[PDB]
Design a protein around this ligand. Structure first.
Ligand SMILES: [Cl-]
Lengths: 413, 413, 413
């Protein structure tokens, strides 16, 4: 049965203190993955759920508060207690959507062991706060209330069609050849193309040349985008961090400013003519007029009014006129729709979950139930995969994919 | 008829400048009672409505701006002009929900005598402002936007089941015996229990020992709660105080900050899993997971979005599946539901009124009409009582209860 | 056909760089007219749309940032290139509703020539910002978030019944006779009365005597009103200016404060008993209890919650029970309703458009469609007139009226 098989996936992908998103393909700890995965662990062991996030901060967080999207843990034997019991990993230099405070609030409020909850939350709170502070200091220099991503990887939605035009400005001349490894695990037709990776690496090399300095990265990056997904997730996380601060009796004045200015910013991304939220390209100084599943995420933030939520509900229904399974990652009528290729059409369980949560919060119970039912149907028939073809339901991407298993467990708790 | 009998109750309970909540039982002036009662007086004499609140501030307000929940006026003969015309009462050391600015705005805008309205509002405005300022200075030291109550009495909902766990931490060892007087007027089965009063008095004695010093009260009180009711009422009152400030041409910059930070705070109390607003226990650092009628009061504040209001509408409908009369003070399916005991189940007219107001403002006209109809039916059949059994409709608590009469008059104006 | 005839009106009323609102009657450039007219020009020539607003700022904006409601351009021959190519107009001393930033955002985002869009927006942005800054500095000295108008002309709704009581305080003793010129073009029955103009001119003479000094104008004007229309339009314009700032990579911190404080202020104008938004009279210190079409404009600002929007939808439906054509400028049951007289009842195309936009944004598609259909029906049958009788549909006021033509073109794009 579903829950039993989901637990098997999480335990197989566990490395003790963290969970790989998928064996082989993603053999390290990822930031937003660990946050979703921790919700799954609440169905197995509460301590284990906390440990996922302790590990992320303890081994990932940099001295300036930055939380990187990958912690490159060295491979260990799946045995405890090993020689290190009887007797500092590298990280990436970019971030990912900051869903972690939302998960921490949930762990804090619902852990049946209240002494443990207080100990873990008090430990993590100043670390979360330092991460959020880094985001505004490094990525919102104009005090807008919106944070900028400098790499499409930071959206978590690597090859979203939203990033096509911004990425077209990234130089690739004299880029040395490099060796792809994702193609050992996943068919290239389901992955970003060569032209995408060329530009992913060009950006990396620029940042590395700049010694990962925030000021020069902001000024020099040829990719500067206000991602609706990243920002909706940050607004939600700020609201949840505020609640933690009050419950723990810390001063949240700083967080209140982020919330209020962020509400203004996130609502600015709404395009009335399109009836949808768009990411913005700050190099071109233009909205990116591509409707992706990320544009539903302000529901999860809780910023729109009901009318606006109702227009999104209509749009989700429209996408459902063309795809059997909600929610495709891009509008199925978009000329960029590719039903098998990663973030250009396939259904993702984490986004179904966040968007169902948002719709529920706005009273759209039928739509929330549909998003759940489709997610669970996909996993029942095809197992725990990274994404699914919205037309056929076929599994795609990573096999034994952790957040799919995790959210199967969480959603059916 | 209802209105004639209501006027009789108010006139019987009048002591000239203020109205007792009920003869014998409550033989002094109470803060939130006087505010609701003033609305009733608008149906008799506008000057008399203003006088209620002038009296509250003139004889109640302390030098630091604190407005106490009781002004202990000495008994006077019900004759005017007496010897004091031909020829400084004590107060309590705690507060109550600050509904007064909302009432003052209404008196100001609707008094047919505009010169009197301007004179009274100009007089009260700096006093209201000083009270609100005291609340944040004394009860929001961490600049959260939410105010803390240190005594269950300050909620106005003395024995709400929400306060059970917080109150369990209040020491009662070596508490001297004391003599209850409420039981002269009301059956003990309809009142807080001995164990409640023991802890009410323990807190009083602690505050008295500390000479009512705010800093030490905040640090030392074993009862520290963010009450959803108190805070929803404060948010509404801040919005109304802002409007008064602008109309009177005073600078409302200070009030704007309270409003904006309070909106963030009040919305934080929403629990998505429960689909309801909870008060928070700041000693435990946890939401109090008990659904009381106070959790509907953010509607009166005007902070939720419509989706959230619709989830509350569903919950009110649920309570109506189990109780004949809305709105019981606690969920009728709660294990703590006691249909006769004060704030643990009985229907209260003031809360029916505030919640109907809120639902109306969100477009839920049928629900608002039901809350009105039930309130009026209860008073028609059982007279003007403090609260009513939600299953049978039987009157309970104080007899000839002032805010019930007052709001009968106001609601049918 | 409609669009062809609309283009003829705009081209006839063009003076090259700006468009007169109507030949003869309004032979200069007006502030809010030019903003609506620019939307019409997008259907003819994008450069021409920008030029309308460049002209307004370049020849209108004063040294302190004030944008005046009229730029008194001298008459030129309708020939180019004239002698000035082969070989500083006066302005008014009051302002008008600041819809211009909203129009600039639209031109910026939708111009197919991106290089031109960036050039024009970068040029206008600091000018818009200076105008908004002037509004708060001169007209919000108490830091309320709401701006005051000192002349009914500044509402754009010159003789709205809302201004009757405030205008009654303006002295007319010893006012010299003057010579009306509007009556050359429009029947007096469709225009403000003598008693209105007497008070319009009295205010002008006061401001002129004070050398148009903001401090003394605020202190001495016998007319000081918080106009719901002006403020709803300003809130919308602030939101749109914020978006421009972020897209252009300018610091919007200042604008964020205007938005947040303005949201508090605009929502304060809601009267729960009336179920409508009122303008406020700051001399009397009272809401003006007259329901005009301006009270729907907070929908265009995007400040109400859905419940409140639904109460406005009900009110619009009510007005439609009494008038064939929505939206009359005042409640058709008002004792002040005059179906032919300017802003006291007639239907206006610009207000139909803004209110339809607002209703659409709140999910009220049927109502938005009705407002569009009525506007287009009126223009099809009666041509492009300043306003229309809501009972009969008969054209009234200015002939060949520019914003009617412009918005016919924009609405049917
Ligand atoms: Cl809403």
């Amino acid at each position: 049965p579903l829950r039993t098989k989901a637990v098997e996936v999480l335990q197989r992908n566990s490395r003790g203190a963290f969970t790989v998103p998928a064996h082989g393909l993603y053999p390290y700890q990822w930031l937003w993955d660990s946050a979703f995965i921790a919700l799954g662990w609440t169905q197995v062991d509460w301590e284990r759920a906390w440990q996922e996030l302790l590990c992320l901060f303890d081994y990932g967080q940099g001295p300036d508060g930055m939380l990187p999207h990958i912690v490159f843990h060295e491979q260990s034997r799946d045995y405890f207690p090993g020689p290190d019991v009887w007797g500092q990993p590298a990280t990436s230099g970019i971030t990912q959507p900051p869903v972690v405070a939302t998960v921490v609030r949930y762990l804090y409020e619902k852990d049946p062991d209240r002494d443990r909850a207080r100990e873990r939350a008090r430990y993590l709170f100043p670390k979360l706060l330092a991460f959020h502070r880094w985001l505004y200091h490094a990525r919102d220099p104009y005090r807008t209330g919106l944070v900028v991503i400098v790499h499409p990887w930071e959206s978590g939605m690597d090859n979203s069609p939203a990033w096509d035009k911004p990425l077209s400005r990234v130089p690739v001349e004299n880029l040395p050849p490099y060796e792809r490894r994702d193609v050992k695990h996943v068919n290239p037709e389901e992955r970003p193309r060569k032209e995408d990776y060329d530009r992913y690496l060009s950006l990396l090399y620029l940042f590395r040349r700049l010694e990962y300095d925030p000021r020069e990265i902001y000024r020099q990056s040829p990719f500067k985008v206000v991602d609706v997904g990243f920002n909706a997730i940050l607004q939600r996380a700020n609201r949840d961090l505020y609640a933690l601060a009050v419950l723990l009796q810390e001063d949240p004045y700083e967080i209140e400013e982020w919330i209020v200015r962020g509400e203004v910013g996130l609502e600015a991304l709404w395009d009335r003519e399109a009836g949808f939220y768009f990411s913005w390209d700050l190099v071109a100084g233009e909205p990116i007029a591509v409707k992706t599943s990320a544009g539903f995420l302000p529901l999860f933030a809780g910023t729109p009014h009901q009318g606006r939520a109702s227009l999104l509900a209509q749009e989700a229904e429209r996408w459902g006129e063309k795809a059997r399974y909600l929610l495709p990652s891009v509008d199925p009528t978009s000329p960029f729709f590719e039903p098998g290729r990663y973030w250009r059409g396939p259904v993702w369980i984490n986004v179904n979950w966040m968007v169902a949560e948002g719709f529920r919060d706005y009273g759209f119970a039928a739509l929330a139930a549909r998003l759940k039912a489709d997610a669970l149907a996909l996993m029942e028939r095809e197992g725990f995969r990274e994404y699914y073809d919205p037309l056929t339901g076929q599994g795609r991407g990573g096999e034994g994919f952790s957040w799919s298993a995790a959210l199967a467990l969480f959603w059916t708790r």
